[PDB]
mmCIF file of C-alpha atoms in Angstrom:
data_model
loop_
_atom_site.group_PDB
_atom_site.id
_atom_site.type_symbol
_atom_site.label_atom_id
_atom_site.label_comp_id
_atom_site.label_asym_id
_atom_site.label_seq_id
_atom_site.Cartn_x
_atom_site.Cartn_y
_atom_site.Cartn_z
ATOM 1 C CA UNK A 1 0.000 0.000 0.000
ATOM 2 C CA UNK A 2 1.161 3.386 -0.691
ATOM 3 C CA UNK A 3 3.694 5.152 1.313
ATOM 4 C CA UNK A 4 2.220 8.924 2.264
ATOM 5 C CA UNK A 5 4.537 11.408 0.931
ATOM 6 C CA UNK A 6 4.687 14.785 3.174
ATOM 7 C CA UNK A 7 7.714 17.416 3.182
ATOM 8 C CA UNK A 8 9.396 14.886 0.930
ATOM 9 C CA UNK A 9 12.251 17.829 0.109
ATOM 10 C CA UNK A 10 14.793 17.380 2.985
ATOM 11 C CA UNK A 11 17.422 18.899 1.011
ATOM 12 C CA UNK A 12 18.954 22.117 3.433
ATOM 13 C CA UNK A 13 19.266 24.189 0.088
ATOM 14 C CA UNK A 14 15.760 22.885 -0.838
ATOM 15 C CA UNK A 15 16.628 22.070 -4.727
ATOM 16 C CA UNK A 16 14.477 18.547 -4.197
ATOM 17 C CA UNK A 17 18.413 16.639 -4.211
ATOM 18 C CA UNK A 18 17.116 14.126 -1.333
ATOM 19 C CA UNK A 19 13.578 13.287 -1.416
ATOM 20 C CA UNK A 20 12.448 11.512 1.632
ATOM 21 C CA UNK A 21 9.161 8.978 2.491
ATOM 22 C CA UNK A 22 8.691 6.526 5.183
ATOM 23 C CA UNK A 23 8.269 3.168 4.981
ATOM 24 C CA UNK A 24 7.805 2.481 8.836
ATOM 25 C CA UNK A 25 7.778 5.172 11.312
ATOM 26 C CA UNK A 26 10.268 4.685 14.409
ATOM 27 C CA UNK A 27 9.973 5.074 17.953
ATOM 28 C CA UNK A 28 10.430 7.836 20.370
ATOM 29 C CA UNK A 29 11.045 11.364 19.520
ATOM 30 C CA UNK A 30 14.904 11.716 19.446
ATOM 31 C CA UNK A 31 16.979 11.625 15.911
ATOM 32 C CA UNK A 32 20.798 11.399 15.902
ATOM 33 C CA UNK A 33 23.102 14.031 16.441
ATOM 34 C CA UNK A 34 26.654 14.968 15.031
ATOM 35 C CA UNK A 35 29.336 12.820 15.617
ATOM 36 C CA UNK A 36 26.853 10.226 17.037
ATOM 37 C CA UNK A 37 27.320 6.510 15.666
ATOM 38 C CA UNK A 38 24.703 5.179 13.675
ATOM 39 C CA UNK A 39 23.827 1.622 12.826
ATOM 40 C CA UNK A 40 21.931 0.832 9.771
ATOM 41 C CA UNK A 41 21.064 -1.491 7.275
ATOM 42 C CA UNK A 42 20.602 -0.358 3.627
ATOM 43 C CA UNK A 43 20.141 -1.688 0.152
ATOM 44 C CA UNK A 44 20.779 1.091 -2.898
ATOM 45 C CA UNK A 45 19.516 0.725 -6.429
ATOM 46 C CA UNK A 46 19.398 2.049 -9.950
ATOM 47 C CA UNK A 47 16.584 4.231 -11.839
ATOM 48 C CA UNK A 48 16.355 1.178 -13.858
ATOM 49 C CA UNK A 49 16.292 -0.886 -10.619
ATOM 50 C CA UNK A 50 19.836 -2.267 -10.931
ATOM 51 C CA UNK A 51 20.596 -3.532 -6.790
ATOM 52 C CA UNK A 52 24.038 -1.770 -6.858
ATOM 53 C CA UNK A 53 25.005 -2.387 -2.870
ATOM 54 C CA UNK A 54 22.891 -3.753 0.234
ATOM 55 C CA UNK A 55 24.554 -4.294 3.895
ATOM 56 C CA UNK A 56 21.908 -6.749 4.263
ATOM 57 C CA UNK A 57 23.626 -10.471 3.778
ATOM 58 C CA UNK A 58 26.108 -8.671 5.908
ATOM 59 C CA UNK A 59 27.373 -10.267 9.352
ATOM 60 C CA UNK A 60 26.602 -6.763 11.012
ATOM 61 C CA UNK A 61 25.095 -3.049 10.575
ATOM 62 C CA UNK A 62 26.999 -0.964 8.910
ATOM 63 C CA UNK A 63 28.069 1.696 11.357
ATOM 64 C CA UNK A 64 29.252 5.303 10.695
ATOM 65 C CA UNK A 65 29.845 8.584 12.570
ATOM 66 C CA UNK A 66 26.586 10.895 11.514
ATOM 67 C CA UNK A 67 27.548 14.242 9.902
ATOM 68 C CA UNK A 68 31.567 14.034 9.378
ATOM 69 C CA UNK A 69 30.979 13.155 5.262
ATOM 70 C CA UNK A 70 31.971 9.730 5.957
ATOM 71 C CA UNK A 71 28.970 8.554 3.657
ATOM 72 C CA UNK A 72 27.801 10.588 1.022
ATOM 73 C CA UNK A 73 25.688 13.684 1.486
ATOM 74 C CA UNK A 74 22.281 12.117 0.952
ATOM 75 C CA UNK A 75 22.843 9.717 3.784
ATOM 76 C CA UNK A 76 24.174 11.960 6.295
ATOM 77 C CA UNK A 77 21.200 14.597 5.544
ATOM 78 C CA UNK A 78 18.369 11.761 5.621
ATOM 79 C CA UNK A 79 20.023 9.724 8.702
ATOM 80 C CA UNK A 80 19.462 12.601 10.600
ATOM 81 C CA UNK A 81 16.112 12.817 10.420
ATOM 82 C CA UNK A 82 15.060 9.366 11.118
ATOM 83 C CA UNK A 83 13.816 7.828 14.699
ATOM 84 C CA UNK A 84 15.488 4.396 15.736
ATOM 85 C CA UNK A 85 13.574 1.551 14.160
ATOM 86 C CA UNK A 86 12.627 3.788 11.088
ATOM 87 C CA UNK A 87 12.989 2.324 7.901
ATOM 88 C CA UNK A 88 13.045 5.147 5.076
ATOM 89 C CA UNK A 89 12.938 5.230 1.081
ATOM 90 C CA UNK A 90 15.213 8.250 -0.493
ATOM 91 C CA UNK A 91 15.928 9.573 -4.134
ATOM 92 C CA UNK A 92 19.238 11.467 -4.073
ATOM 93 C CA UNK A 93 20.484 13.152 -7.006
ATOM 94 C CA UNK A 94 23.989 12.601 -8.100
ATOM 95 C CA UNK A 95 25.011 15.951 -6.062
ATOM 96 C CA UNK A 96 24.204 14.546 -3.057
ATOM 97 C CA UNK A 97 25.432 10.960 -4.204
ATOM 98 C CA UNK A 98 28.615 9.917 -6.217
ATOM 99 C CA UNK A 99 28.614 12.855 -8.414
ATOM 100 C CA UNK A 100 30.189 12.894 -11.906
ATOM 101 C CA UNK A 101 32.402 10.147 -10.712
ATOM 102 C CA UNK A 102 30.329 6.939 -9.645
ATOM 103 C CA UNK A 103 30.826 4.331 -8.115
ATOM 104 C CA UNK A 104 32.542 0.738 -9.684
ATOM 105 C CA UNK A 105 31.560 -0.570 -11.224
ATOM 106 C CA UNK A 106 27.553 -0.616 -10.691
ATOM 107 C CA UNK A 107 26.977 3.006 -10.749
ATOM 108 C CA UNK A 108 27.358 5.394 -13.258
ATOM 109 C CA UNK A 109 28.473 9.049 -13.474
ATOM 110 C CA UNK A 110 25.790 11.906 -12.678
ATOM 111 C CA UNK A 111 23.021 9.281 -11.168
ATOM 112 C CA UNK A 112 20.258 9.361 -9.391
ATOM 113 C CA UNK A 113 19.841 6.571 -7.055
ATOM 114 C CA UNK A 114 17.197 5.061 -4.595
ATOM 115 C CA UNK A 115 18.323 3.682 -0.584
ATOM 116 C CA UNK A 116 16.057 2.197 1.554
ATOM 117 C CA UNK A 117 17.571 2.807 4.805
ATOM 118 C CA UNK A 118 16.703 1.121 8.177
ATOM 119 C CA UNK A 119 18.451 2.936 11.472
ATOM 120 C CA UNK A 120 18.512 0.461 14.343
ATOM 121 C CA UNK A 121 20.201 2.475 17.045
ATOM 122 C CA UNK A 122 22.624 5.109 17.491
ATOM 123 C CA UNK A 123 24.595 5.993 19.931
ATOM 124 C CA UNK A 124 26.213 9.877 21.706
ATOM 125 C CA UNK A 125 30.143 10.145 22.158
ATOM 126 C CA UNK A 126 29.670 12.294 24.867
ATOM 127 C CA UNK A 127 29.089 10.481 27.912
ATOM 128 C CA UNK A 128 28.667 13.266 30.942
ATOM 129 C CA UNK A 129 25.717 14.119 32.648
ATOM 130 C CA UNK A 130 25.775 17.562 31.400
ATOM 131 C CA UNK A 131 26.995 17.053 28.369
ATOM 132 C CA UNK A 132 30.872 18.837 28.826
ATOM 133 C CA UNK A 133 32.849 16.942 26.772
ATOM 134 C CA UNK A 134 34.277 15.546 29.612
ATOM 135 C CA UNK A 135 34.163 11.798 28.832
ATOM 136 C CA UNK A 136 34.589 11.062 24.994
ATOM 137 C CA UNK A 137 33.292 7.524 23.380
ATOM 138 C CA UNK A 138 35.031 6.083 20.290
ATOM 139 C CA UNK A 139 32.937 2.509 19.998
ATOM 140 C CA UNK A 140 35.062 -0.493 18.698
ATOM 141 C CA UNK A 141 32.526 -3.107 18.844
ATOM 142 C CA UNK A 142 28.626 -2.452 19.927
ATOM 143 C CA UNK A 143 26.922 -4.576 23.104
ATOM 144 C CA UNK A 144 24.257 -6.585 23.351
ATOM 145 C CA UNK A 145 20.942 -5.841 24.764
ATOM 146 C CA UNK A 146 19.760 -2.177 25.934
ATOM 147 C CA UNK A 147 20.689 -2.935 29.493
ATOM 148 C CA UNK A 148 23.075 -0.998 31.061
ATOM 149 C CA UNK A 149 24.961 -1.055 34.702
ATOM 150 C CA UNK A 150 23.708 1.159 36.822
ATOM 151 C CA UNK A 151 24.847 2.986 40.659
ATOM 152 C CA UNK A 152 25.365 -0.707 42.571
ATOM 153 C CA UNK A 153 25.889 -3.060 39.507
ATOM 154 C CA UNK A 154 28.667 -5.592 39.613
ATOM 155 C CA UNK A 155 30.495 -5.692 36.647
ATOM 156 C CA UNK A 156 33.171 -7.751 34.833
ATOM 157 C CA UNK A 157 35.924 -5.425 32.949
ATOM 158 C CA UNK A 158 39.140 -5.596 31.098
ATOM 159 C CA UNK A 159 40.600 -1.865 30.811
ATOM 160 C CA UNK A 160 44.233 -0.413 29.814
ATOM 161 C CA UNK A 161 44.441 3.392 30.841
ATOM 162 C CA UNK A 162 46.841 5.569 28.632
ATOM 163 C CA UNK A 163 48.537 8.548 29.158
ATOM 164 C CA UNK A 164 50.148 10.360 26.577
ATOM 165 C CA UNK A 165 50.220 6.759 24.389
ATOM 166 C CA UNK A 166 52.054 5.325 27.486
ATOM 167 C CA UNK A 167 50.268 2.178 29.526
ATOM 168 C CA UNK A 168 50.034 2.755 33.027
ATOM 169 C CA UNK A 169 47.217 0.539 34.009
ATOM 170 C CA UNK A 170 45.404 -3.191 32.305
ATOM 171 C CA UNK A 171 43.680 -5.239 34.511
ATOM 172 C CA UNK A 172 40.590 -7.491 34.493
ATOM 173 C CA UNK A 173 38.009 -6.795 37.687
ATOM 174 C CA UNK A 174 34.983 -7.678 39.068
ATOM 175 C CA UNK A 175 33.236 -4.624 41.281
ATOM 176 C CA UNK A 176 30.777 -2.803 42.091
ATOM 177 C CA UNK A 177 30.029 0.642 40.381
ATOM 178 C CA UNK A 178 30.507 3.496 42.688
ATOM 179 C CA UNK A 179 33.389 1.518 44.417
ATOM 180 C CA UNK A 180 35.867 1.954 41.598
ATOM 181 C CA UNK A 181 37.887 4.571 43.582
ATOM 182 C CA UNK A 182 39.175 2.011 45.574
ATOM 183 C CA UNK A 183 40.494 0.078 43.187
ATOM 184 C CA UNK A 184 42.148 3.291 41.239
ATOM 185 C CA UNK A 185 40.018 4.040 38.967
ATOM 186 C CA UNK A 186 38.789 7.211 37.854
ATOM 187 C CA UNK A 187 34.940 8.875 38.290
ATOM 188 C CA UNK A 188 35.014 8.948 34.456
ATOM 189 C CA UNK A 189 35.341 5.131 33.973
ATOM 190 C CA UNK A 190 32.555 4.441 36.154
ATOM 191 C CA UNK A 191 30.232 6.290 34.481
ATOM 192 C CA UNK A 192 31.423 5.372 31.217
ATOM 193 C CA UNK A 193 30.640 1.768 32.056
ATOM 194 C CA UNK A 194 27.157 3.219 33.021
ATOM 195 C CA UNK A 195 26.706 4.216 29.711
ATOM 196 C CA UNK A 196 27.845 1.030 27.781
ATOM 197 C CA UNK A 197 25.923 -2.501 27.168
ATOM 198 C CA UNK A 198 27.573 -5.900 27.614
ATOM 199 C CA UNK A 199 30.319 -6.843 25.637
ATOM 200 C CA UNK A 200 30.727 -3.067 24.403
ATOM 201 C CA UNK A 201 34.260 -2.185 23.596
ATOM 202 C CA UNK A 202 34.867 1.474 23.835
ATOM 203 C CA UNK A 203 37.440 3.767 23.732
ATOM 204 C CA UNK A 204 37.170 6.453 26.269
ATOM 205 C CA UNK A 205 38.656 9.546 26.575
ATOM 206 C CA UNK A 206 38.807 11.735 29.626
ATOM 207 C CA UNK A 207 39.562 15.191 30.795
ATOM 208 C CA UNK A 208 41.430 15.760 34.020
ATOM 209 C CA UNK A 209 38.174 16.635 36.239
ATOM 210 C CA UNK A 210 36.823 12.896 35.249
ATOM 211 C CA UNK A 211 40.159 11.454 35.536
ATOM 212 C CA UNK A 212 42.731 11.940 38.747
ATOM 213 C CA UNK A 213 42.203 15.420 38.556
ATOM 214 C CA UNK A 214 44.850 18.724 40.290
ATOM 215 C CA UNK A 215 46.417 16.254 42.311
ATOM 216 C CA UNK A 216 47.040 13.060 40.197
ATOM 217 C CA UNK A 217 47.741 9.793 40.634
ATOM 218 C CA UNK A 218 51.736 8.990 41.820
ATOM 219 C CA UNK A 219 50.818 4.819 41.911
ATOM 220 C CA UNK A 220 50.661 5.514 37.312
ATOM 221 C CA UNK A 221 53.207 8.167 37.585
ATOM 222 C CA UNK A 222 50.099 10.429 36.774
ATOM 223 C CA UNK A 223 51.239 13.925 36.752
ATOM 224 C CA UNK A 224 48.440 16.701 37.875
ATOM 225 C CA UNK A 225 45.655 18.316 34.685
ATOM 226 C CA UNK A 226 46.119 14.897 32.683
ATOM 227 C CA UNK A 227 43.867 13.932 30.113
ATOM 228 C CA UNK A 228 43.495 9.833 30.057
ATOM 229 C CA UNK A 229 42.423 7.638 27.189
ATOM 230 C CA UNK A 230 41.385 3.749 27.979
ATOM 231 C CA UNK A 231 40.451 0.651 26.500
ATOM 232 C CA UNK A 232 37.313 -0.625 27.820
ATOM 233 C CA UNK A 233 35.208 -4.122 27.401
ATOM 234 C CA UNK A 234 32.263 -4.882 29.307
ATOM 235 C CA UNK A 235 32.228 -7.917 29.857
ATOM 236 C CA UNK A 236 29.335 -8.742 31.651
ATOM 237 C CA UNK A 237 27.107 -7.083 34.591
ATOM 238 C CA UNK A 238 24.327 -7.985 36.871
ATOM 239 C CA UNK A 239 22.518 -4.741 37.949
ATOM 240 C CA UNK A 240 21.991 -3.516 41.384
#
């Protein structure tokens, strides 16, 4: 049955480049954000209906960071303005596609093409509370399930922290969020494994006030104001 067309230009400049409908509305309210990364599946044709690329008989979603060109312009304009677990159709001029160059060797130059895009989930870099910059996420690999540990949870981690590219930390532990102190690890870890889902691999990146702060930490030969990167795995949690 048809699919409604309504405000089907979602081209910025408004020169009908990306033409948007929805196959199945999403849930919630929020759409993704810059610099957010965004799992979909997609298949791309042809005008004459030549199947060109799908991530479909794929072992995963094909993930991207929203809004940094990584994709072409079509796809970073309609992304954003889908809910998770809306699946849309677009027509993108060659402008906001592959241009006078194409793509090998399925697509040719100045083409118009058709995506039907599905977004599954996406997912903020910026981890803080109020939203500082304070804790940075760079996913490796996505979790599974939406659970996530909360103030209480025992959880199961591997983690290396970094400073300046140097390893001053990797250990495996069991504990209890909101007892990490104890063990020598920063505020900014803690709630970075807040934010994450099990078996989530994440880089993190913190600034000094989420990391060992004025002071330091003399055990890592952590000098005073230092920003910290780690490696992070969830490995498994049971909340409360």
């Amino acid at each position: 049955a048809p699919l409604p067309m309504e405000g089907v230009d979602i081209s910025p400049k408004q020169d009908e480049g990306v033409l948007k409908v929805i196959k199945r509305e999403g849930t919630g309210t929020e759409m993704p954000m810059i610099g957010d990364r965004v799992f979909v599946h997609y298949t791309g044709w042809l005008l004459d209906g030549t199947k060109f690329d799908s991530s479909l008989d794929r072992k995963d979603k094909f993930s991207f960071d929203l809004g940094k060109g990584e994709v072409i312009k079509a796809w970073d304009i309609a992304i954003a303005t889908m809910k998770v677990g809306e699946v849309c159709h677009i027509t993108c001029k060659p402008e906001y596609a592959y241009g006078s160059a194409g793509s090998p060797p399925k697509i040719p130059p100045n083409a118009t093409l058709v995506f039907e895009v599905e977004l599954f989930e996406f997912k903020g870099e910026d981890l803080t509370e109020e939203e500082d910059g304070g804790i940075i996420r760079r996913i490796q690999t996505r979790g599974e399930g939406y659970a996530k540990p909360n103030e209480g949870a025992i959880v199961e981690v591997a983690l290396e922290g970094y400073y300046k590219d140097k390893l001053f930390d990797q250990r495996e532990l069991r504990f209890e969020i909101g007892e990490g102190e104890n063990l020598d690890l920063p505020y900014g870890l803690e709630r970075a494994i807040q934010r994450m889902e099990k078996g989530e691999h994440s880089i993190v990146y913190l600034k000094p006030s989420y990391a060992f702060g004025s002071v330091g930490k003399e055990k890592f030969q952590i000098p005073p104001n230092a920003e910290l990167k780690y490696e992070l795995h969830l490995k498994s949690f049971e909340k409360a």
